[PDB]
Amino acid sequence: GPADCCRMKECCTDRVNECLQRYSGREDKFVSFCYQEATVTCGSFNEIVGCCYGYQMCMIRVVKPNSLSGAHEACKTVSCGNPCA
Amino acid sequence: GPADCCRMKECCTDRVNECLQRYSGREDKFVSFCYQEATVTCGSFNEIVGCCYGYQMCMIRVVKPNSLSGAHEACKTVSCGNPCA
Amino acid sequence: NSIQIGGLFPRGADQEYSAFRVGMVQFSTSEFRLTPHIDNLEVANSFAVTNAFCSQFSRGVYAIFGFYDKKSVNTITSFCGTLHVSFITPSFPTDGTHPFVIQMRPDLKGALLSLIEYYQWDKFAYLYDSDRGLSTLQAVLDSAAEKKWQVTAINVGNINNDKKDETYRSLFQDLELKGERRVILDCERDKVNDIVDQVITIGKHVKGYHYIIANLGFTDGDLLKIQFGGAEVSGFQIVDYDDSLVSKFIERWSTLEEKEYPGAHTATIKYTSALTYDAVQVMTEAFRNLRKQRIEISRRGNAGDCLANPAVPWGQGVEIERALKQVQVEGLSGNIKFDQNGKRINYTINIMELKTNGPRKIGYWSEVDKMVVTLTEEQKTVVVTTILESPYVMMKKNHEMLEGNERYEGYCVDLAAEIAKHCGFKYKLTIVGDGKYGARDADTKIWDGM
Amino acid sequence: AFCSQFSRGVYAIFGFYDKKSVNTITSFCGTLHVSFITPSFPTDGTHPFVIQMRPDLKGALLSLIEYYQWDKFAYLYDSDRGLSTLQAVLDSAAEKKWQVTAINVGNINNDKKDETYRSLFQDLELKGERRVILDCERDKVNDIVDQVITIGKHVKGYHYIIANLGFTDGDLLKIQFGGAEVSGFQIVDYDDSLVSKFIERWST
Amino acid sequence: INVGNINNDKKDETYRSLFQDLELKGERRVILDCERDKVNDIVDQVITIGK
Amino acid sequence: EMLEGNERYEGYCVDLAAEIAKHCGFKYKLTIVGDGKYGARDADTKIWDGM
Numbered sequence: 002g003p004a005d006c007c008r009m010k011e012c013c014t015d016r017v018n019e020c021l022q023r024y025s026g027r028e029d030k031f032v033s034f035c036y037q038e039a040t041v042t043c044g045s046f047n048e049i050v051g052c053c054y055g056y057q058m059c060m061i062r063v064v065k066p067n068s069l070s071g072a073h074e075a076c077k078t079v080s081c082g083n084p085c086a
Numbered sequence: 087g088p089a090d091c092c093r094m095k096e097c098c099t100d101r102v103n104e105c106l107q108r109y110s111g112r113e114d115k116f117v118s119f120c121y122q123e124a125t126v127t128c129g130s131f132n133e134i135v136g137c138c139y140g141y142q143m144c145m146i147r148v149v150k151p152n153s154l155s156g157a158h159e160a161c162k163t164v165s166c167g168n169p170c171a
Numbered sequence: 172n173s174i175q176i177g178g179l180f181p182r183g184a185d186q187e188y189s190a191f192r193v194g195m196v197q198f199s200t201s202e203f204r205l206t207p208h209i210d211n212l213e214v215a216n217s218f219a220v221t222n223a224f225c226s227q228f229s230r231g232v233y234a235i236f237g238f239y240d241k242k243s244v245n246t247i248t249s250f251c252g253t254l255h256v257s258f259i260t261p262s263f264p265t266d267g268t269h270p271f272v273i274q275m276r277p278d279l280k281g282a283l284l285s286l287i288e289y290y291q292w293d294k295f296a297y298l299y300d301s302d303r304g305l306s307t308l309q310a311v312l313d314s315a316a317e318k319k320w321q322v323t324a325i326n327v328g329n330i331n332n333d334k335k336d337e338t339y340r341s342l343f344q345d346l347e348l349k350g351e352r353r354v355i356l357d358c359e360r361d362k363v364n365d366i367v368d369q370v371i372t373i374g375k376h377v378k379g380y381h382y383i384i385a386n387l388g389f390t391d392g393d394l395l396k397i398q399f400g401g402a403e404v405s406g407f408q409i410v411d412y413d414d415s416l417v418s419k420f421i422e423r424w425s426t427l428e429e430k431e432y433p434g435a436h437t438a439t440i441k442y443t444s445a446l447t448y449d450a451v452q453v454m455t456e457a458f459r460n461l462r463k464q465r466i467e468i469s470r471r472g473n474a475g476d477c478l479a480n481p482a483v484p485w486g487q488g489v490e491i492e493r494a495l496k497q498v499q500v501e502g503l504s505g506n507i508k509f510d511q512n513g514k515r516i517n518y519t520i521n522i523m524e525l526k527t528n529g530p531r532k533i534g535y536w537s538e539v540d541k542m543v544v545t546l547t548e549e550q551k552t553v554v555v556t557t558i559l560e561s562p563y564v565m566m567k568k569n570h571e572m573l574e575g576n577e578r579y580e581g582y583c584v585d586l587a588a589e590i591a592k593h594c595g596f597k598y599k600l601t602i603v604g605d606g607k608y609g610a611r612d613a614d615t616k617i618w619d620g621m
Numbered sequence: 622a623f624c625s626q627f628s629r630g631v632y633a634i635f636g637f638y639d640k641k642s643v644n645t646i647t648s649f650c651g652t653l654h655v656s657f658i659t660p661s662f663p664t665d666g667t668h669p670f671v672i673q674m675r676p677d678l679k680g681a682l683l684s685l686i687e688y689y690q691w692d693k694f695a696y697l698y699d700s701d702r703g704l705s706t707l708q709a710v711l712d713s714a715a716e717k718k719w720q721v722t723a724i725n726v727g728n729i730n731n732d733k734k735d736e737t738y739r740s741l742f743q744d745l746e747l748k749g750e751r752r753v754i755l756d757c758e759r760d761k762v763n764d765i766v767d768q769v770i771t772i773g774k775h776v777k778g779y780h781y782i783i784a785n786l787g788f789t790d791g792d793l794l795k796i797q798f799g800g801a802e803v804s805g806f807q808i809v810d811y812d813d814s815l816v817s818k819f820i821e822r823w824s825t
Numbered sequence: 826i827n828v829g830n831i832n833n834d835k836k837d838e839t840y841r842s843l844f845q846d847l848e849l850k851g852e853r854r855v856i857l858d859c860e861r862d863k864v865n866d867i868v869d870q871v872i873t874i875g876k
Numbered sequence: 877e878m879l880e881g882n883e884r885y886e887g888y889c890v891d892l893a894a895e896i897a898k899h900c901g902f903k904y905k906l907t908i909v910g911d912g913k914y915g916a917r918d919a920d921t922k923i924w925d926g927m
């Protein structure tokens with residue numbers, strides 16, 4: 002049962018987004034929580050790094066309250082970086 | 087610049103295929119060579135593993151002489167597995 | 172029962188008219204006799220074609236046999252379509268639905284594509300010119316997109332013969348670049364021969380290359396040039412000389428005097444001329460079937476001016492057309508029958524491969540069955556590369572007095588002797604040039620060493 | 622019609638031709654030394670006694686492809702203006718590293734064509750190809766456009782290149798808001814004073 | 826959102842602004858409660874903006 | 877006795893098998909050879925016995 006980092010990435014972004022959608026206006030606060038849930042749901046090659054690290058950083062630095070949709074839409078294509086470190 | 091496992095995969099399959107195209111009819115012999123060249127051009131997180139390992143395996147066992155196109159088309163969606171070890 | 176039929180022979184076409192005359196003699200009957208009016212013209216010239224067509228028309232011919240070019244073919248189709256005059260041609264089949272045209276030449280598309288599928292070609296190069304039209308090109312492109320083929324389409328017709336030397340060298344250079352070996356030539360026989368000569372000149376006829384000549388004249392041209400080159404060549408043959416009909420016809424053809432019938436003294440015959448002969452057969456049998464069905468197509472008065480506006484066609488023409496299309500006969504091209512549109516049906520294209528001893532038929536192609544296959548068909552000194560390492564390979568003290576494998580001593584030397592001894596070959600010990608074991612250069616990406 | 626004009630003793634002829642009829646025109650005008658001027662597509666070769674008003678589009682298109690840096694795309698053509706452009710871009714694809722998918726949309730009959738386009742763009746979905754070049758007359762262009770909008774491929778991520786001099790001659794309002802990039806060629810600049818004045822007189 | 830108070834003569838960009846504001850929230854799932862005419866209008870506008 | 881399939885066996889060759897199968901991307905079912913021999917050629921019948 003291979004994880005396939007690309008599929009892992011698409012899953013990661015998708016789960017993060019779908020999670021952040023539940024929190025309206027608090028979106029910028031819960032980024033890390035939803036990233037935790039996403040890393041849990043999609044699995045990870047390195048439990049510390051998570052499914053996609055670059056997307057998480059991108060979201061944390063970009064996402065502002067109520068700005069969710071556009072921010073995510075901008076951040077979902079970003080490079081995830083090194084999945085093992 | 088930044089590393090992306092997904093970009094690495096999509097690049098990997100293409101470079102492998104494009105490499106095997108020059109070797110038409112001897113294609114089943116050169117899978118590993120072209121995989122080396124592709125791993126070099128697209129980069130890899132672990133020099134041993136390569137850009138996409140599962141695709142390489144799938145190609146190695148599936149690819150028959152002149153059957154390349156169908157083989158690659160079948161193998162390019164395959165899970166790369168863990169690009170750590 | 173004099174039947175007036177016009178005909179158009181391109182200047183320089185001899186064996187075609189020769190086989191036409193032979194056809195006139197052989198298929199002649201006491202019942203009726205065809206009275207041909209031959210007109211020589213420039214086939215590529217539309218004006219000339221128009222003039223000749225209207226000339227034959229005003230002469231009141233019941234049918235016309237001729238040739239056309241990519242330029243002139245629309246003139247023929249349109250005029251024959253308007254004036255309801257039947258036209259029979261050996262020239263390339265029209266792509267579309269064209270009435271009042273009887274195309275003797277079979278469709279080569281199926282045979283070619285089935286051949287590609289037979290050889291399992293994933294990627295190849297396609298060399299074409301615009302003469303017979305781009306119909307085949309369109310076909311192989313659409314089938315390439317459907318079957319996921321990567322095809323290199325290159326037009327060799329637009330290159331001027333005066334300046335074409337380095338153009339072809341550059342062509343096959345660009346073609347060698349990608350390592351693409353498989354090559355298909357769809358061209359006129361002249362252009363074919365030119366490209367061939369350029370290939371032997373550039374030494375691309377060596378082993379590893381596969382050429383596919385698309386035409387019905389595969390054995391009509393000289394195959395002796397690339398025969399010994401060592402490259403595989405395949406093609407299509409519309410005339411089987413193993414058949415009794417073709418064999419006897421060939422005996423009579425070869426006994427003919429060259430002075431009376433130009434270029435008619437030969438072992439073989441060009442497929443176009445053969446198609447002409449078969450066309451004569453088709454016309455004779457058609458009018459015979461018209462007389463047996465008791466239908467009189469005889470003209471009451473002269474046709475008048477073809478360009479007279481508005482044009483009025485004669486009624487009989489349709490009957491003559493149907494008469495021609497309903498014909499089914501046996502000839503040099505194999506079984507001859509036509510559909511409603513006038514294209515060939517149920518033909519047989521022999522699939523042939525050029526071998527060392529000569530050409531041979533490897534199979535046949537049918538419109539239905541597609542490809543069907545016919546009958547299924549010293550020691551070199553081994554170079555041993557090694558590097559100097561102790562005590563694996565070392566130079567003897569006296570080595571200057573010795574030569575070859577006696578120069579070296581070591582573990583690997585003895586092991587080499589043993590391997591060669593059990594595997595039974597002669598071996599030559601050599602030291603690697605760069606003096607490395609093996610490696611991949613990060614820059615050139617080239618493997619160096621043994 | 623040509624011989625009709627000829628016997629009337631005309632000094633020149635202005636007209637149009639088709640892939641079928643163009644050889645008739647060239648041969649007759651070349652033979653009878655009558656000048657022919659046409660807006661229709663330029664003949665490929667050296668034809669005397671023909672003045673072709675339409676400019677050559679090949680160079681502009683190829684330069685545009687090199688400008689957008691397209692490595693792989695799909696090329697949609699018809700047999701109406703001829704395959705000259707197709708042959709050209711195929712030769713330049715052979716010279717470059719281009720991967721080109723050539724598909725003939727001209728042999729498809731308009732009465733029965735619904736699923737023909739669905740299958741076409743299905744095959745286009747096979748390779749995932751988002752770059753497409755349309756070489757066609759404005760009618761086929763418009764039809765193909767409607768078919769694109771119907772299946773919703775006119776959204777962002779797609780890039781269409783229309784090859785003709787009529788880029789603003791067809792209706793672009795349909796795909797204008799879709800969010801897909803569209804590029805094309807214009808032989809008439811309405812910003813010019815001459816053209817502006819002509820349009821002012823034209824609209825009245 | 827009330828789509829009934831929009832006059833047909835000036836209504837082009839009103840729908841673009843509507844669905845832009847709807848893109849703000851990322852809202853995909855949408856329920857149309859309308860007369861068949863307004864339904865057709867909104868649908869066509871949806872096809873135009875490729876939603 | 878409480879387990880089934882590949883969970884029944886443990887050992888070096890077992891782990892190695894898991895690794896090889898994991899690398900080659902196939903599902904594997906561990907089975908013990910019938911005759912309980914490694915391999916041999918009978919000099920008379922010329923039949924191979926064992927794995």
Ligand SMILES: *[C@@H]1O[C@H](CO)[C@@H](O)[C@H](O)[C@H]1NC(C)=O
Pocket residue numbers: 516517538539
């Ligand atoms: C000839 O080909 C047609 C299809 O074009 C097929 O229906 C027919 O059966 C064939 N006839 C023979 C004798 O093979």
